[PDB]
Amino acid sequence: PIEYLLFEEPTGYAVFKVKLQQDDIGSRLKEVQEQINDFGAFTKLIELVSFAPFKGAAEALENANDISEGLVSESLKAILDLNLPKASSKKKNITLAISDKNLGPSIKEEFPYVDCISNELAQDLIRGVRLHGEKLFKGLQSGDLERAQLGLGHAYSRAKVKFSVQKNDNHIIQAIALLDQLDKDINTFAMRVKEWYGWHFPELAKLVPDNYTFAKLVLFIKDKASLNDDSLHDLAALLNEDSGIAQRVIDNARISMGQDISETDMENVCVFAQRVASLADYRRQLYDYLCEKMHTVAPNLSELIGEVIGARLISHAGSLTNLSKQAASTVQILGAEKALFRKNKGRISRYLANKCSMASRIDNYSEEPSNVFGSVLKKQVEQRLEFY
Amino acid sequence: NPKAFPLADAALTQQILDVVQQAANLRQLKKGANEATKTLNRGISEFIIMAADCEPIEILLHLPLLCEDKNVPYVFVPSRVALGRACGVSRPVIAASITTNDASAIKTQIYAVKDKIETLL
Amino acid sequence: SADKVDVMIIQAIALLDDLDKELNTYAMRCKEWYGWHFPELAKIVTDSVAYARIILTMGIRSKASETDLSEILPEEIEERVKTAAEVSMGTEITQTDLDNINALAEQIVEFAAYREQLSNYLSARMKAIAPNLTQLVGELVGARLIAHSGSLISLAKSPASTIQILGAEKALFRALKTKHDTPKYGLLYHASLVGQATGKNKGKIARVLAAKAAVSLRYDALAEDRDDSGDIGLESRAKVENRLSQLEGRDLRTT
Amino acid sequence: GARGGAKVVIEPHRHAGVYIARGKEDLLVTKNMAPGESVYGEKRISVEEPPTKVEYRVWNPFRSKLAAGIMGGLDELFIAPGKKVLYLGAASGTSVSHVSDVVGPEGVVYAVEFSHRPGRELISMAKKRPNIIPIIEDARHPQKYRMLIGMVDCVFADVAQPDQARIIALNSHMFLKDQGGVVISIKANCIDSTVDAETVFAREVQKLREERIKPLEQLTLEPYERDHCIVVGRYMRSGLK
RNA sequence: GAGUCCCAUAACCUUUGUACCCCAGAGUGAGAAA
RNA sequence: GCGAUGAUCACCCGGGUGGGUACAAAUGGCAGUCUGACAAGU
């Protein structure tokens, strides 16, 4: 006695009309079980009448939650109203086949004239629609049922877990891999700036060993022949004259064995030196982002030891969750290769490891961690410090 | 809803602490949260007992994640003061674990509690 | 003359290789770090620079609806990223996060811009220190050949056979000591002329091109009054092309 | 044993998608979908292939019951490359990640979990593996997540519940294809600790037949586990006779 | 005539230089102080 | 005015030898740059 069938797709709601009713008493017979698999036989049973796709991803998640709780959405109420014919509440009622029994009572309240069936006979028809899927839609634009499930699957799952970006700590792991990487490349490229400008005027490579000081000076002193008292004051402003280099560069610029390089060659040195200047500036910007981000993610661990040290500890564990799950002993050897936590010296190291473990647990399993416990935990370490 | 969950009732806590004390005498009890984590890693724990008033409660909330990954029963008792006293040590104990041993004298009591904890979960 | 010093070439080629390594690592991580926000981009757009430019034009998947990627991507690629944006599995990021990811992306395009600048710089250097060699083998392969020997003069004094197998010492000396066949391309394999050849002709063109490369190279190194024109290279190039044409014209199959 | 610097020989296993790493000791390994990281700290093997660096992950039998089944010599494993697998009781990526490797990019894995704490890492893992769809929902009510799952070639269940037979039957009826696979992990203690393990295993097999699932083979997981067995069956809607 | 395709754009060994290290490691687990 | 939120647990003469981890450099070593007159067409 089934006349209409409701199927919920990730893309939308699909309503079918049952043309022929399959045998009821012989439901368990093999041949009626096979016809569900065979599309040629199945298409004789049901036909698609309506399909109302969801407006977008946001609507799909809302209706998935409503369907999960056995509720009727405003979209579902619309499609059923458009299709199902009006019938008496008592004398005769239109029959609708639904997958979920919990959804049955809700549909009855909205539509008193429709009777919901979810017995085994209904399940078989629902199984067949799920089995053939898009083939029954007669080409109607149902997108792709496999891609929408993946997006909706992640959406539905995280909504129940209340997964948030605030808990996210992978931003910390990447930025460490940036900071040490930037330091290596800044040093590497800075050294190359020395050699290229070393050919033109080698003596400067001796004058101001500080690597970042060369580039700004090399950006200024492009050609050693250019030597003016005003320029001397300008380069004197760069850094300080206490070292006396401002006078030395002018003197050595007057007397040096450096071979003059071409204008194009100098164009590269300043440009290559300019690149090194940007990376150091970016590296400082990122290091500040790490300081801020760590306080948000792991305030207890950050306060106890420091933002950078805690981040390296998190990366070595692979995740803040991994660090929390490790025992106190494992954490101590986690930072025993870089001496992060470093006979009496070892005792403080082992003691600090235990405190760091507890600080991570508070950070890891708290929705909005505070630094109140990290501060007292560090203070407890401070009291331990003078005692030994 | 509360982070410490499930919390044993008064009747069950009394039974749990009985097993904890007898385990302490028979050297089948590991005391402290750090010990509990190790036993879970070695997979040598009948079940884990934790204190629900640990200050803060978060410093032992790693153990439930380890346990239910390993399918080990766990339960929270209201008092760390009582748990330490039952454990047999002169300090409060926030977490303890019963070691796996099929040759123990208190096998029946341990499995008796373990079945109850499983029903609670 | 400041424009005829070869140590710039050896430094430039070494630097150019290092830049390729560094730019790659930053790009992989921009894919991972921004992929956290939107993991589907890396499969659609593989190019690092094109990937980075997308982050600059649009920061967030919401922006994908209105942002236009026409100048970065063709019509079919640009629509695909838009569709992935709404069905994206990624999380939302704060403007604090977006600022630093944009900062990383800006470094990608800047490095890509400068890598082009260094490549053009090396081309200018190679066309003034060895214009004849560049006409025959090319700026890139020619620079590596000079860098391998360490100096233009050192390469000039090497016979043509060595230049053919200059970059394959590992296979050469293994084969020589174990009485097996030796390599036949070396570093010259990546020359354009060798690419045009096919089958066994590649070995023949390498022998022909290496012989002419020594002719054009020695003129660059040892000519007191060389004109910066590449005339010896151009005429040397014509001979190899003629050799390739008749070499490729022949058909082994009976007609 | 299997130390860092040691070298091993990788060869294919009888089951598609599973490999053996030979040497002084043999290791069951699976090709890494997301190279360069370990989900639960397992050892990894790298091979230089013309050259791209492919990686392989060691499958620990003592941690995954499915791996214990492969070690014990299961004749048929419906989990294979390019197949959809519904994983019930997916606590975390200890076993789901390896199953994701076997199915490969073409296949998918619907990981179902109830507890929110293990689920959060299941989300974190799944974002590395595009073929995994984590469903944080109770396996007791498949009607809640019917929107999220299509038909699946095989159903793998590691749920440790006393009425898992009801859970398997409901999920199989909704999502398992006819003639599809069912792989069950049964722990005697969880179902009924009052009776011996053999009585439990015989009783569970009877329930599966009642639910139109034909058992094909049974295997006990010793020495890796005690009182554990894996039952492999086929979902024969038409008839089991 | 002849292995680019096992990174000679490299690996390994040695010397030198710089910075740290000389307790257990799936570390142990109820003593310490008097 | 303690503690399971964790107590306890190489050599030689102030000086020199021995061992270990990481990175950089070497115009330091392995380490020695293939053959040599025919080929293709009617």
Q: Give the pairing type, strands A12-18 and D108-113.
A: unpaired
Q: How far is A153 from C184, CA to CA, in rounded Å?
A: 57
**CA of residue C184 to C1' of nucleotide F32, angstroms:** 18
Across the B:D interface, residue pairs with CB atoms under 8 Å apart total 16
> What phi and psi values does residue C4 have, to the nearest 5 degrees?
-130, 50
CA distances in angstroms from C94 to A289, C84, C97, listed in the order given: 12, 20, 5
User: Please, which residues have CB within 8 angstroms of residue D137's CB and are 6 or more apart in sequence?
Assistant: A68, A156, A157, A160, D112, D113, D114, D144, D145
Q: Provide the 8-state DSSP code for C45.
A: -
Distance between the alpha carbon (CA) of C145 and the C1' atom of E2, Å = 21
Question: Residue D148: which H helix or E strand, with range?
Answer: none
CA distance A357 to A255: 61
Which one, of A241, A244, A360, A239, lies nearest residue A298 by Cα?
A360
Phi-psi region of D178 (alpha: psi -120 to 50; beta: other; left: phi over 0): beta
Q: How far is B17 from chain A (nearest CA, A)?
A: 25
Separation CA C93–CA C87 (nearest Å): 16
| Chain C neighbors (3+ CB pairs < 8 Å) | A, D
Q: Which of the 8 DSSP states describes residue C62?
A: G
DSSP, residue by residue, B4-54: S-SB--HHHHHHHHHHHHHHHHTT-EEESHHHHHHHHHHT-EEEEEEETT-
Instruction: Strand E: list positions under 7 Å from protein Cβ.
Output: 1-10, 20-21, 23-31
Query: Terminus-to-terminus CA distance in chain A, angstroms?
Result: 86
- Nearest of A127, A144, A156 to residue A66 by alpha carbon: A156
Largest CA distance in chain D: 58
- Strand E contact at CB of residue C207, distance < 7 A: yes
**What's the CA gap between A59 and A160, in Å, rounded?**
16
- Please give residues of chain B from 4 to 23 whose alpha-adjacent beta carbon (CB) lies under 7 Å from any atom of strand E: none
Structure tokens at C122: 């090396």
Chain C residues 147-206 with Cβ under 7 Å of strand E are 147-148, 164, 167-171, 173-175, 178, 180-187, 189-190, 200, 203-204, 206
The 8-class DSSP code of residue D234 comes to E
Give the DSSP letter string of C135-174: HHT-HHHHHHHHHHHSSHHHHHTS-HHHHHTTT-HHHHHH
Q: Rounded to the nearest 5 degrees, what angle is found at the Cα of A243, between the Cα atoms of A237 and A247? A: 65
**DSSP helix/strand/coil, D194:** coil
CB A125 within 8 A of CB A46: yes
Cβ burial of A71 (10 Å; 0-12, 13-18, 19+) is middle
What Å value separates CA B83 and C1' E34?
A: 29
- For A8, A48, A83, A126, A178, the CA distances from A114, given in Å and listed in that order, are 18, 19, 12, 18, 62
C163 Cβ contact partners less than 8 Å away, ≥ 6 residues apart: C145, C155, C186, C188, C210, C213, C214, C217
Q: What is the resolution of this structure in A?
A: 3.2
Contact list, C90 vs chain D (CB under 8 Å): 127
Residues of B in contact with D94 (CB under 8 A): 69
Integer Cα distance of C237 and C216 in angstroms: 10
Closest CA to C49 of C66, C73, C79: C73
In what side-by-side order are the strands of the sheet with B45-51? B29-31, B95-99, B45-51, B74-77
3-state secondary structure chain A: CCCEEEEECCCEEEEEEECCCCCCCCCCCHHHHHHHHCHHHHCCCEEEEEEEECCCHHHHHHHHHHHHCCCCCHHHHHHHHHHCCCCCCCCCCEEEECCCCCHHHHHHHHCCCEEEECCHHHHHHHHHHHHHHHHHHCCCCCCCHHHHHHHHHHHHHHHHHCCCCCCCCHHHHHHHHHHHHHHHHHHHHHHHHHHHHHHHCCCHHHHCCCHHHHHHHHHHCCCCCCCCHHHHHHHHHCCCHHHCHHHHHHHHHHCCCCCCCCHHHHHHHHHHHHHHHHHHHHHHHHHHHHHHHHHHHCHHHHHHHCHHHHHHHHHHHCCHHHHHHCCHHHHHHHCCCCCCCCCHHHHHHHHHHHHHHHHHHHHHCCCCCCCHHHHHHHHHHHHHHHHC
* CA A346 from centroid of its chain's CA atoms: 38
State the smallest CA–CA distance between residue A9 and chain D in angstroms: 6
Q: How far apart are CA D182 and CA D170, in angstroms?
A: 12
- A330 contact to strand E (CB, 7 A limit): yes
Q: List chains adjacent to chain A, taking adjacency as at least 3 C-beta pairs closer than 8 Å.
A: B, C, D
Element (H, E) at D157: strand D152-157
Q: In what order do the strands lie in the sheet with A4-8?
A: A46-53, A12-18, A4-8, A94-97, A114-117
Strands D132-136 and D228-235: unpaired
Strand partners, D87: D111, D156
Residues contacting residue A263 through CB under 8 Å, at least 6 positions apart: none
Nearest to A161 among D108, D136, D145 (CB): D136
Query: CB neighbours of C43 closer than 8 A, spacing ≥ 6?
Result: none
From CA B92, how far away is CA B84, in angstroms rounded? Answer: 4
Question: Residue A150: its chain D contacts at CB < 8 A?
Answer: 108, 130, 133
Checking DSSP bridges between strand A4-8 and strand A12-18, what pairing results, if any? antiparallel
CA atoms within a 13 Å half-sphere pointing along the CA-CB vector of C29:
25
Say if strands D108-113 and D176-187 run parallel, antiparallel, or are unpaired: unpaired
Strand E-proximal residues of A, range 268-327, CB below 7 A, are 327
Specify which residues A115 forms β-bridges with. Answer: A95
Chain centre distance of CA B71: 14
Q: For residues A100 and D141, what is the distance between their CA atoms, to the nearest angstrom?
A: 10
Token couple for C134: 């560049």
Could you tell me how many CB contacts below 8 A there are between chain A and chain B?
31
Secondary structure element (H or E) that encloses residue D167, with its range: helix D164-175
* Positions on chain F within 7 A of a protein C-beta: 3-9, 21, 27, 31-36, 40-41
CB contact under 8 A, B68 and D118: yes
Q: Cα(C237)–Cα(C249) distance, rounded to whole angstroms?
A: 18
d(CA C247, CA D7): 47
d(CA A320, CA A72): 41
Give Dmax over CA atoms of chain B in angstroms. 39
Name all domains of chain B by residue range, CATH numbers in brackets: 1-121 (3.30.1330.30)
CA-to-C1' span, D31 to F30 (A): 38
Task: Please name every residue paired with D157 in a beta bridge, in sequence order, or none if there are none.
Answer: D88, D184
The minimal CB distance from A133 to the residues D135, D145, D150 is found for D150
How far is D112 from D106, CA to CA, in rounded Å? 20
Å from A325 to nearest chain B CA?
A: 6
Residue with tokens 């990686």: D55
Residue D147's H or E segment, with its range, is none
Which ranges in chain C belong to alpha helices (H)?
Answer: 7-37, 41-44, 48-57, 75-86, 95-129, 131-136, 139-149, 152-156, 160-164, 169-178, 192-196, 201-222, 231-249
